[PDB]
Amino acid sequence: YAKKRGWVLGPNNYYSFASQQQKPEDTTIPSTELAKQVIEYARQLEMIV
């Protein structure tokens, strides 16, 4: 596991790499696809005509 992956034994301590990202801010990706979902409602509130 030390030669393939990380887990480097140093001063009697392993070190596994780790992070995280952040995304609550994007109202923009539910802006385009929601606009598609609202129109395809109103497309189908008519058109069997």
Binding site: T27, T28, S31, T32, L34, A35, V38, I39, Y41, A42, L45
Partner: protein, 154 residues
């Protein structure tokens, strides 16, 4: 508006507006009872009116009256929009209270498909969905109008 036109009194033994050339003179004017009592048709007669409509006068007449720029992309100011939807849900609530008893009692007592629930009624399945029809068009537009400015205005 109407236009009239005097006929001579000497030609009262022959035709007055005679000599049928066409057959379009019958559906362009139908004189009502209040018109044929004063002078029609022994004194004067009526004449047909059409409207000389052309371009660069008629199209620009509507290119300036019933037009808009920002009316589509403008919010309905939710202080009274969702306040309006309160008084629409509550009234179709009462029509749904009215709808529950009405049809099912009528069908289970007598199957006549007829009288006083046919001659002078107003609570069919014509009244309960037009409030739903107004409530969609007022909101599906209003939902989608607030979707554009999220993309367009950053």
């Amino acid at each position: 508006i109407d236009a009239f036109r005097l006929i001579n009194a000497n030609m009262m033994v022959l035709g007055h507006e005679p000599r049928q050339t066409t057959s379009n003179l019958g559906h362009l004017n139908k004189p009502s009872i209040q018109a044929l009592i004063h002078g029609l048709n022994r004194h004067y007669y009526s004449i047909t009116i059409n409207y000389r409509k052309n371009e660069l006068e008629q199209k620009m007449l509507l290119n300036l009256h019933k037009k808009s720029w920002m009316e589509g992309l403008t919010l309905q100011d939710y202080s009274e929009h969702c306040k309006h939807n309160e008084s629409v849900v509550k009234e179709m609530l009462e029509l749904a209270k009215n709808y529950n008893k009405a049809v099912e009692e009528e069908d289970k007592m007598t199957p006549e498909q007829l009288a006083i629930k046919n001659v002078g009624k107003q609570d069919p399945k014509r009244h309960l969905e037009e409030h739903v029809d107004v409530l969609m068009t007022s909101n599906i537009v209003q939902c989608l109008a607030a979707m554009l400015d999220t993309v367009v205005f950053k």
